[PDB]
Design a protein around this ligand. Structure first.
Ligand code: YH0
Ligand SMILES: OC[C@H]1O[C@@](CO)(O[C@H]2O[C@H](CO)[C@@H](O)[C@H](O)[C@H]2O)[C@@H](O)[C@@H]1O
Length: 238
């Protein structure tokens, strides 16, 4: 295989020779240099947005991959210039990633219940790396996890303090923001190619009557998501 060794390692991690498995993902995968500005920004995002109540583990970045899923950017076009585009976290079990990279993030079918979907059947993201990392269900035995950075086209946000359990938004609303008590310091936000990166260290939001500790972002159209990076993380438990 002519692929870089980090990419070979990733392929083995989420699965028949290696190259056919790579072509099975239908995804261009490049290694972001560890000494690049991209990598510095992403490591800062990981460092600053770890919650205090997720003190069960520390996160260390092993490898950062730049991913382009076949056809995804072509279908994100309708939302490419939509205001309020943010770079957000999405965690998931390693076992799922083979699907995620080949089919993209997807929404539960209409026949599925709304139980367990705090803000309806959609695609969920976080601005706190620990909140997304919790959804990797990493164990002390296998302390390596995968997590996505995705450009989400949030547009006009429906800001909610309590759960709705429905996936239908009012007219002129493109996403839902679950308001948490703690948000990244907005004066530290930066723009990485027209896309906001809320990598500020956590502070209080002032939102009082909220059921969430940290923010959530939900979109209800797969075309509103554009995966940009895939991180491999060492979980260091206490
Ligand atoms: N992955 C992230 O980075 C991420 C980030 C921020 C908020 C997030 N919410 C989810 C989430 C939601 C819903 C589901 C989901 O299949 N429920 C349906 C199944 C179900 N029945 C339940 C009944 C009770 C309690 C929990 C339940 N989950 C999974 C993940 N993932 C989030
Ligand atoms: O009521 C939705 C509101 O937003 C728009 C933006 O074009 O549609 C977005 O929101 C819906 C989410 O439920 C989806 O129908 C659609 O895919 C999504 O882009 C408008 O259609 C509408 O005014």
């Amino acid at each position: 295989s002519k692929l870089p060794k980090p990419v070979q390692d990733l392929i083995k991690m989420i699965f028949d020779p290696i190259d056919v498995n790579y072509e099975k993902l239908k995804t261009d995968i490049k290694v972001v240099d560890r000494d690049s500005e991209e990598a510095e920004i992403i490591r800062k995002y990981v460092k600053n947005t770890h919650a205090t109540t997720h003190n069960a583990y520390d996160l260390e970045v092993i490898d950062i991959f730049k991913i382009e899923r076949e056809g995804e950017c072509q279908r994100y076009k309708p939302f490419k210039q939509l205001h309020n585009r943010r770079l957000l976290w999405h965690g998931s079990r390693t076992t799922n990633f083979a699907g995620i990279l080949s089919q993209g993030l997807r929404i539960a079918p209409p026949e599925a219940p709304v139980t367990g979907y705090m803000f309806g059947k959609g695609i969920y993201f976080a601005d706190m790396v620990s909140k997304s990392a919790n959804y990797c269900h990493t164990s002390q035995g296998d302390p390596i996890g995968l997590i996505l950075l995705g450009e989400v086209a949030l547009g006009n946000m429906y800001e909610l303090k309590h759960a709705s359990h429905i996936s239908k938004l009012p007219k002129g609303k493109h996403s839902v923001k679950g308001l948490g008590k703690t948000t990244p310091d907005p004066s530290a936000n930066i723009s990485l190619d027209g896309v906001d990166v809320p990598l500020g260290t956590g502070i209080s939001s002032g939102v009082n009557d909220t059921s969430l500790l940290y923010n959530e972002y939900i979109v209800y159209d797969i075309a509103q998501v554009n995966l940009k990076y895939l991180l491999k993380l060492k979980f260091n438990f206490k």
